[PDB]
Every structure is written in C-alpha cells, then in structure tokens.
From Swiss-Prot, chains A, B:
Source superkingdom: Bacteria
Full-protein interval shown: 125 to 283 of 315
GO cellular component annotations of the record: cytochrome o ubiquinol oxidase complex; plasma membrane
Periplasmic side of membrane: 1-159
The protein's name: Cytochrome bo(3) ubiquinol oxidase subunit 2
Its membrane topology: Multi-pass membrane protein
Its job: Cytochrome bo(3) ubiquinol terminal oxidase is the component of the aerobic respiratory chain of E.coli that predominates when cells are grown at high aeration. Has proton pump activity across the membrane in addition to electron transfer, pumping 2 protons/electron.
Biological-process GO terms, alphabetical: aerobic electron transport chain; aerobic respiration; ATP synthesis coupled electron transport; electron transport coupled proton transport
Keywords tagged on the record: Cell inner membrane, Cell membrane, Electron transport, Lipoprotein, Membrane, Oxidoreductase, Palmitate, Respiratory chain, Signal, Transmembrane, Transmembrane helix, Transport
Organism for this UniProt entry: Escherichia coli (strain K12)
Knockout or disruption consequences: Increased reduction of the ubiquinone pool (in aerobically grown minimal medium with glucose).
Protein localization: Cell inner membrane
Activity regulation field: Competitively inhibited by piericidin A, non-competitively inhibited by 2-n-heptyl-4-hydroxyquinoline N-oxide, NaN(3) and KCN; 50% inhibition occurs at 2 uM, 2 uM, 15 mM and 10 uM, respectively. Inhibited by Zn(2+) and Cd(2+).
Assembly mode: Heterooctamer of two A chains, two B chains, two C chains and two D chains.
Disulfide bridges in this chain: none
C-alpha cells in the first residue's frame, strides 16, 4: 500500500529512486492518488527545497542528512514541483512532475514503462555521470538501480 | 600591508582570488610571513572547512554566506591546508598549500609569476568551466580576474 520514494537533488535536476520497484527517474514521479507516499530526501549539492505547492508539501534537502515527508494526494492529476528559488542559473530549470495517477493499475503501468528503459543506474560511477552539471534535464527512466544507492550517497558527506 | 584573499571551495579543489592584486589561483596561496592575511570564505558546493592546522586556522565555507578568518604567520615556510574529512572520493585530493614567504619582495615576485600565466578568470562562464567536477587538481594561476567575482558567486545562492 504505502509507496517509498528516495529523492536526491542533483545539480539542476531531481533524481528519484523507487527502492521497492527497482527503478529510478529524473524530474518525474508517479504514484496512485489516495495512497500514502513516503519520501526520503537528501541533497548531493547545496541545500535545496523539495516543494509541491498544490499539495502543501515542502521539505529541505541537505547533504549528509535524510529528511522525510509523508504525502497523500486525494485528487488524481499531475502537480508541478519546484525547487529552491536561488537566483543562480540552472536552478530555474530545476522543476519536476508529480503524477498522482487515478488508481494503482495506472501506477503499475508507469513502473512497466520504466522497466522497459535500456539505460540503468547500477553503480556509483553511473551515479556521478548523471550527477555531473546539467541544466533543463528531460525526464528519464532507469529499469535497474543499485539496491542501497540512497545510503551510498549520504555516506559521501559523513565527517 | 594587509593581504585580502577570497576563497571558494569548488568540487574537489580550492579556488583563491586576490582582489587587490588581480590574480586568482587553484590549490595554492602565498603571502608574506608576519603580515595580516584577511580571508573571505564561501562555498560553491556543500559546506566545507578551510583548515590550516599548523596555523590553528579553521573556518567553515558555506554557499550563500561569507565567513572571515584573520591570520598572521610568524615563521616563514609552506604550510599544508586540508579540507573537510568527508568520506567521499574527491574530498581526499582537496588539499592546498600555504606559502608564508620570508618577506614581501618574495610575495611581490609570486604575484609576478602569476601575472605571467596565459590563462585568465575574466567571466562567469570561465568560472563554471573551472567549477566543473575535477579531482586532484594541480596548482594553476590566472593573470586576470573579473573584479567582483566573489560577490557574483554568493549571489548564486541568495533565496
């Protein structure tokens, strides 16, 4: 029933991981409406803001630390997500999309469309490649992800 | 008499600017011993630590904010500078060098060796190029720098 999503604000794009489903995406998340969505958030750069106005959901993202946000979307639809309003270039294109699908079958189907992507997120080398400075990043799916990649990222900023 | 140095911890290297002299360098600073050195510090990435153990000098570097450290080196020499001990790769090669030269004539001469570099730091485009992810960066000089480049960097993380 509850969906867990791991968020990592990279330089000028958002990266999302679906620990239970085995996928990861960039600038786009989906989940069934009227369902408990569980976000684990962290930054891999400067501190940021995981903000979805329409859903009254805001949570900071900071390197070295994992924040949490619990969300329920009651009406189906696609909500926009914005990031921190820093005046710097690159932050401006740092938006993402929240697809609160009409039901779970629709969610299941979105996973399936992801599991069909050729490109994966299997190791940290792949991680830093994606992590490299990029503006206005387009949506992207990854049919496979390294098991504890969220943890691995936090450990980069431990002491 | 007092020397002002602007510090910016980039991803896995240190960048230094000499506002009054007109130069900038990477992983290496110099100043005459027994002279007041004035550091303005900021980060362009995660928070860091501008640390020179031998001189009992530590100051955090944070994006959006300018910290300050006042230092006097009494004995001439070259002191090592280390950064924050995060467990992440890239941080390990984030070291720099503190040349507290025997006197000012020697300092003046170090400027001169810098003013002779072909490569400059004239605009923000040049800034982000340097700013791009790079490990074990070697020392480098820039004979020219954009006047208020430190300010320009802080403004990237204003709201």
């Amino acid at each position: 029933k509850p969906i867990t999503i791991e968020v990592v604000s990279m330089d000028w794009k958002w990266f999302f991981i679906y620990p239970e489903q085995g996928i990861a995406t960039v600038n786009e998340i989906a989940f069934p409406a009227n369902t408990p969505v569980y976000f684990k958030v962290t930054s891999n750069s400067v501190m940021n803001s995981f903000f979805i106005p329409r859903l009254g959901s805001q949570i900071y993202a900071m390197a070295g630390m994992q924040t949490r946000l619990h969300l329920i979307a009651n009406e189906p639809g696609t909500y926009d997500g914005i990031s921190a309003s820093y005046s710097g270039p690159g932050f401006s294109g740092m938006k993402f999309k929240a697809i609160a699908t009409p039901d779970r079958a629709a969610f299941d189907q979105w996973v399936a469309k992801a599991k069909q992507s050729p490109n994966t997120m299997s190791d940290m080398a792949a991680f830093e490649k994606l992590a490299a400075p990029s503006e206005y990043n387009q949506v992207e799916y990854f049919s496979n992800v390294k098991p504890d990649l969220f943890a691995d990222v936090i450990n980069k900023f431990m002491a």
